[PDB]
Amino acid sequence: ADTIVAVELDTYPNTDIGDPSYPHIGIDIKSVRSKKTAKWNMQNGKVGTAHIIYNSVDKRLSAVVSYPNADSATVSYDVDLDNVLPEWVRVGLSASTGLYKETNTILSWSFTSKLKSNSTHETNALHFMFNQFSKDQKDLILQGDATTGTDGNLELTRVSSNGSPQGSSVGRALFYAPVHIWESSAVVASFEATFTFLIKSPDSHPADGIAFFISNIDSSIPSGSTGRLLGLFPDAN
Amino acid sequence: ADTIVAVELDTYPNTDIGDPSYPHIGIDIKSVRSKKTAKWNMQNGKVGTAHIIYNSVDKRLSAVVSYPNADSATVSYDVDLDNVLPEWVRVGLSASTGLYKETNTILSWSFTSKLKSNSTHETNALHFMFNQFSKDQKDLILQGDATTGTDGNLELTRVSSNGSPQGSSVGRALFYAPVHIWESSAVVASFEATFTFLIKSPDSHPADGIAFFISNIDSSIPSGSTGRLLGLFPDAN
Amino acid sequence: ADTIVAVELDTYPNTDIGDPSYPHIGIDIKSVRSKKTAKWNMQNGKVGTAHIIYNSVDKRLSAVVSYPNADSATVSYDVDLDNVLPEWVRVGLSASTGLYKETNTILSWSFTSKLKSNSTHETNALHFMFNQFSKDQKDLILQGDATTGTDGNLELTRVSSNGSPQGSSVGRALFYAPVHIWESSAVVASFEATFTFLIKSPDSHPADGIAFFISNIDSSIPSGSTGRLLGLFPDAN
Amino acid sequence: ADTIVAVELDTYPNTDIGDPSYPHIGIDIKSVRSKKTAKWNMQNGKVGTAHIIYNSVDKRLSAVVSYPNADSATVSYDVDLDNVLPEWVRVGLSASTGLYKETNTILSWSFTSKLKSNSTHETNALHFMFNQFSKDQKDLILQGDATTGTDGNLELTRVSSNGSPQGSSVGRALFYAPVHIWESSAVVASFEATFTFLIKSPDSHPADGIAFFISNIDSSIPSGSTGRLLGLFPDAN
Ligand SMILES: [Ca+2]
Ligand SMILES: [Ca+2]
Ligand SMILES: [Ca+2]
Ligand SMILES: [Ca+2]
Ligand SMILES: [Cl-]
Ligand SMILES: [Cl-]
Ligand SMILES: [Cl-]
Ligand SMILES: [Cl-]
Ligand SMILES: [Cl-]
Ligand SMILES: [Cl-]
Ligand SMILES: [Cl-]
Ligand SMILES: [Cl-]
Ligand SMILES: [Mn+2]
Ligand SMILES: [Mn+2]
Ligand SMILES: [Mn+2]
Ligand SMILES: [Mn+2]
Ligand code: NA
Ligand code: NA
Ligand code: NA
Ligand code: NA
Numbered sequence A, B, C, D: 001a002d003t004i005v006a007v008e009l010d011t012y013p014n015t016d017i018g019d020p021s022y023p024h025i026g027i028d029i030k031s032v033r034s035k036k037t038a039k040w041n042m043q044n045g046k047v048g049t050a051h052i053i054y055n056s057v058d059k060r061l062s063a064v065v066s067y068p069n070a071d072s073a074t075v076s077y078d079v080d081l082d083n084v085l086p087e088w089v090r091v092g093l094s095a096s097t098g099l100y101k102e103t104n105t106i107l108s109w110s111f112t113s114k115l116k117s118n119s120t121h122e123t124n125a126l127h128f129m130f131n132q133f134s135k136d137q138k139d140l141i142l143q144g145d146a147t148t149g150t151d152g153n154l155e156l157t158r159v160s161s162n163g164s165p166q167g168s169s170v171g172r173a174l175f176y177a178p179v180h181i182w183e184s185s186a187v188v189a190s191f192e193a194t195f196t197f198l199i200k201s202p203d204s205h206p207a208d209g210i211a212f213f214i215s216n217i218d219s220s221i222p223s224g225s226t227g228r229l230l231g232l233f234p235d236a237n
Helices: none
Strands: A004-010 A024-029 A036-039 A047-055 A060-066 A073-078 A088-096 A105-117 A123-130 A140-144 A170-175 A186-198 A209-215 B004-010 B024-029 B036-039 B047-055 B060-066 B073-078 B088-096 B105-117 B123-130 B140-144 B170-175 B186-198 B209-215 C004-010 C024-029 C036-039 C047-055 C060-066 C073-078 C088-096 C105-117 C123-130 C140-144 C170-175 C186-198 C209-215 D004-010 D024-029 D036-039 D047-055 D060-066 D073-078 D088-096 D105-117 D123-130 D140-144 D170-175 D186-198 D209-215
Touching: A004 A047, A004 A060, A024 A060, A024 A073, A036 A073, A047 A209, A047 B186, A060 B186, A088 A105, A088 A186, A105 A170, A186 A209, A186 B047, A186 B060, B004 B047, B004 B060, B024 B060, B024 B073, B036 B073, B047 B209, B088 B105, B088 B186, B105 B170, B186 B209, C004 C047, C004 C060, C024 C060, C024 C073, C036 C073, C047 C209, C047 D186, C060 D186, C088 C105, C088 C186, C105 C170, C186 C209, C186 D047, C186 D060, D004 D047, D004 D060, D024 D060, D024 D073, D036 D073, D047 D209, D088 D105, D088 D186, D105 D170, D186 D209
Parallel strands: none
Antiparallel strands: A004 A024, A004 A209, A024 A036, A047 A060, A047 A186, A060 A073, A088 A170, A088 A209, A105 A123, A105 A186, A123 D123, A140 A170, B004 B024, B004 B209, B024 B036, B047 B060, B047 B186, B060 B073, B088 B170, B088 B209, B105 B123, B105 B186, B123 C123, B140 B170, C004 C024, C004 C209, C024 C036, C047 C060, C047 C186, C060 C073, C088 C170, C088 C209, C105 C123, C105 C186, C140 C170, D004 D024, D004 D209, D024 D036, D047 D060, D047 D186, D060 D073, D088 D170, D088 D209, D105 D123, D105 D186, D140 D170
16 A cells, blocks of 8 residues: 555544544544544635645644635644655645535645755755646646646546536646655755645535645555545545 | 844853753753753864754744764754744844854855745745855844955954954844744744854864844844853843 | 836836837836837736846846736846946835826735855845735835835825825835845846736826836935836936 | 757867867757857866756846856857747756766756746746755656766766776766746746766866756657767767
8 A cells, every 4th residue: 555644624524534523634644534633614615725844853744724814724743754754755636525525626736845964065955836737737647537727727626617526536636756855864854835725515515625645656546535535545544 | 131042053061051061052042041952063173054943833943953974963942932032033143252262154144934824825935045245245234243255254253364263252143134033914934044154263172152043123242242142142041 | 316227017108208108118227218118008907917037147137017818018128237236236116106196006026136156155145025015014115105014015105095096106115135236256146026016096097107126225216206207217317 | 859958068179060179168959069159168177067047038048157266158049949849848967978088977956947927826836956866866867877876976977986987978867857848828937957067087188078958858868979969969960
């Protein structure tokens, strides 16, 4: 199986797998059963922004999600990712629907990783920023139902031509290049990601959510990972 | 009195004010008596690099110092700087000598502060990077004995024309513009600084050290802050 | 008198000072009579974005202005700014109204200047980015009628509480720190600026425009520089 | 055949293919016979730095090369790269030796490409920075004789364990991800690259040089491109 570290924006409460009884943001370390969660007052049909941060000195994976005119939600978990993830990874976004559904539209996505060594010329960095997505976005690996280019956006899950989200959908987008997240000479290592999203559902109960994730380089959508599994995990263990 | 948050590279052990019995790096919150320290294997005459990091989600002020071919030293302290510092600050470097002495030469200095709001256009930022210093560096406020331009460097404390550091010296350099470190709409705030330095002494016992500091905007060198007080504090309380 | 280099977004045609008979963008080198102009299909009440670019290798000052869903306008002028501007400058935004009027609202403003030397550690940089403006924006020098904080924006010229722009207004905002634009060791020097703006008028004929400008450090609004002079020049010479 | 745009640091004068009678820097558009050249006072065994710049408004490909304590060399050529290169490219470094030889050592390499659209959220960017190279640098495609990790450097051409450069060698390194260099909505597009290099030869006549290049995504070393062809071209046409 793949190795997954993720921040979930979980829109549907599956209480038998540890979700609280409301939409929430969570830190997922190798399991869909979040290590830490916080209540998320998700707004159907509104554009929100998520920020994810981590550094090797503090060893705390943190996330903040907000909408204009609203308070933020935040969640943090103390974890040494050097002990979870391999030295080289890919980074991505994932989303799913199940018997309940929503659009999982990404309007923008940025990422920066840095490794500062003890040499006088210390800094290695990777940065990418998408504020629009082309019909042929060659620097993204699209998996499952994910598509790019419709209204300049990344649609992680299936949407019909009239905007209607489809159930039982899963899709991911990964940046094309492998990312160096640990190095033997690095004295400070850090990563951050930001994405803006539009989750809209014609229903009172949207599902299932969007995640930012970091994985082994050859990661692929696990079998049967629609719905509550967010395209990230093969089961709910 | 001024309000000071600082990371000290303390080259001389003053044990009656809480210094350990060796050169060390420390986190100073409104006092020269560091809240946290770590042993620092300072290398007389070698160019080193210091990194300082903080963000408002984790509320941990951390620093790493290293030399090429050597292990790093690191120190961290949990502190909500929103409860210490004002909303607007200046940032700077400070150094001192006393009856023992050293050069306090800065070869480069960079700083980045960011405030990300809950608006869709979220980011405010300030960044500066000096890899050399002019004889007339108009975007730096020089205090005390600090000078710029000699060999393209910033000399925080007095050095003679032949390279000899002078005792009983104190000097600081602050970036000209005020820096916005907290804002009511910010959902993520962060700062980082890096500087490279050359501390050299003709003596077996160098003193007193270099600090990166954040202060009220009108901060000035306190009276009698040579030596163990690092140009930062009026006393050892 | 001050020394001014500016890119003008000129909303009102003053044909006796060389304006074409339509709104236009122009490169102004020490005179309001632009050295080069291009037609600008200004859209009353819509948010637009302007980009300004220059580097010391190509010695060409260029600007691009656009609105969503519209083609851009662009203008360029070959000029060695080393022969116009001093070594240290301030950078700013300026706007005016006269007997005709408009809002001159700035929603965001960013700037980056770089000096790369022939040393192995080559880069000096200054960068600032405002995507919102506080009621007390301490890193901006506000001149004339300019204010910050209303709806998080920078209003360069006077607007009443109900949104009504006032005539005979002039105002500027300059970044607090001096900016190093030329240095003897620099092998590549460059600057860029971007700003987003909302020019709205209740009238069919808005006036007078907005400019991004670079000036001597002590620059101030010239006397009688309302209207066609854009807050930049004391006369139309 | 591949499509190549390159900046050459040409260490050996091949006068029958248009080289001047000295080491030189050149702009190569689809041919090793540079469209523009400038004299380059190459220093055997010294670390130098090259900068390459281009933007879609000015349509001028420019390069600057320097060593510490020395004047720079610069070359520029007016060319609309939209008419040369495809929309998506890869970027890389190339070097060669022939019957004359040199080390072609890369100590650092950075690249930034930006596409700014007419949307209010305008910016797309890719940036990478290597100040060291790992024995397994997964985000680089190494071609021919190129290797990474020896002393933390990228060796484009073959070097023995004792530092001796080998003749008849060719090697390239390309960034793993495709790069978007033109887009239909982009109102400003730009790229820049910097690399630091050490060319050393035990001989009075080093050869053949190093190039920064942009190519079709599937570019590969052409047959027989050792020596004067710099790993870039299949012939001298
Ligand atoms: Ca769930
Ligand atoms: Ca001490
Ligand atoms: Ca006019
Ligand atoms: Ca040649
Ligand atoms: Cl939210
Ligand atoms: Cl529900
Ligand atoms: Cl150290
Ligand atoms: Cl001692
Ligand atoms: Cl426009
Ligand atoms: Cl008119
Ligand atoms: Cl050179
Ligand atoms: Cl020769
Ligand atoms: Mn959950
Ligand atoms: Mn101490
Ligand atoms: Mn005009
Ligand atoms: Mn040549
Ligand atoms: Na939403
Ligand atoms: Na030292
Ligand atoms: Na407008
Ligand atoms: Na060389």
